[PDB]
Amino acid sequence: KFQCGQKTLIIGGEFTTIENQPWFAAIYRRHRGGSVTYVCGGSLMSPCWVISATHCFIDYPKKEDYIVYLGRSRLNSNTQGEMKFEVENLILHKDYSADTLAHHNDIALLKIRSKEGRCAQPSRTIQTICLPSMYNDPQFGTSCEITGFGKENSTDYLYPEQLKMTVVKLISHRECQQPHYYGSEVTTKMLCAADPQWKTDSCQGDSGGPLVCSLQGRMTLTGIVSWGRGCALKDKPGVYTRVSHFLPWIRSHTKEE
Numbered sequence: 001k002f003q004c005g006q007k008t009l010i011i012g013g014e015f016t017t018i019e020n021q022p023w024f025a026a027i028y029r030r031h032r033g034g035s036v037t038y039v040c041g042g043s044l045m046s047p048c049w050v051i052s053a054t055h056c057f058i059d060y061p062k063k064e065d066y067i068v069y070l071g072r073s074r075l076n077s078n079t080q081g082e083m084k085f086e087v088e089n090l091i092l093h094k095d096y097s098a099d100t101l102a103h104h105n106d107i108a109l110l111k112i113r114s115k116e117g118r119c120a121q122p123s124r125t126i127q128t129i130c131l132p133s134m135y136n137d138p139q140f141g142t143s144c145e146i147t148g149f150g151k152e153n154s155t156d157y158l159y160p161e162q163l164k165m166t167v168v169k170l171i172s173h174r175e176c177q178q179p180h181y182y183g184s185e186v187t188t189k190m191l192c193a194a195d196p197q198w199k200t201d202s203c204q205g206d207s208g209g210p211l212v213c214s215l216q217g218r219m220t221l222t223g224i225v226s227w228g229r230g231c232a233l234k235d236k237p238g239v240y241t242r243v244s245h246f247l248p249w250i251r252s253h254t255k256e257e
C-alpha cells in the first residue's frame with residue numbers, strides 16, 4: 001500500500017530513474033495519429049489524483065485527449081513497470097490568470113483511471129507524495145528537489161530522453177520582489193527557488209512538475225513548476241505555485257464534490 005514521500009532505496013545537472021522520484025507523473029496528449037506528445041509534469045496525490053499546473057491544459061481543455069504515465073523515466077519509450085492511465089476528470093483553477101511572464105493560481109488536478117477502470121497501484125516505481133498541511137511550509141534556504149523532462153538549455157529545440165532532476169534553494173518572498181529579480185510580479189501564493197550560483201534551474205517543459213522538500217521527515221509537495229524569466233539566469237530564479245495556499249481548493253475538489 002501507498003506510504004507518501006518514501007522511495008525504495010532542467011538546466012540542472014543530473015539524469016535519474018523514476019524510483020528516485022516515484023510520484024512523478026508524465027502527462028501526454030493524444031493526436032491524429034497517434035502520436036502522443038509530451039505536455040507537462042505532474043505528481044501523484046492519492047491512487048486516483050495527479051496534481052499539475054493549469055497553464056498546461058489551457059490550449060487543449062479536452063480531458064479525453066490526455067494520457068498519464070506513472071513509473072516512466074523515458075520521454076518516448078517504455079519503462080518496465082510503467083502504468084498508463086486516462087483522465088476522466090480534468091479540473092483547472094477558475095482564478096487562473098497570466099500576463100506575459102507570470103502565471104497566478106497555476107494549479108490543476110487530474111483524476112486518473114486505466115482502460116480497465118483501475119486506479120494507481122503502489123510499486124518500487126510508483127508512489128504518492130505528501131501534501132503540505134495548512135500553513136506550514138519549509139523555511140527559506142531549504143534545499144529542495146525539482147524533476148522534469150524539460151529543456152537542458154533554454155535555446156534547445158530538443159528535450160532530453162532521460163528524466164532529469166536537480167536541487168535548488170528556496171529564496172525569500174522579499175528577495176524575489178527586489179527590482180533586479182521579479183519585483184511585484186511575484187506574489188505570496190508563489191515561491192521562488194534557485195541555485196546560489198545560478199547554474200541549475202527548471203526550464204521549458206518542466207511545467208507542472210514537483211518541487212519536493214523534506215519537512216519534519218515527510219517528503220512533501222511544496223511547489224509546482226510554473227514560470228520564470230529565461231532559464232538559469234542570474235537574479236531570475238524559478239517560480240513555483242505554493243501548494244499549501246491551495247489545500248481548501250484540493251480538498252473541495254478531491255474528496256467528493
Ligand SMILES: NC(N)=Nc1ncc(Cl)c2ccc(S(=O)(=O)N3CCC[C@@H]3C(=O)O)cc12
Nearest residue numbers: 202203204207226227228229230231237238
Ligand atoms: N526557472 C526559470 N528560470 N524559468 C522557467 N521556469 C519554469 C518554466 Cl515552466 C519555464 C518555461 C519557459 C521558460 S522560457 O525561458 O522558455 N520563457 C518563455 C516564456 C518567457 C520565458 C522567457 O523567454 O524568458 C522558462 C521557464
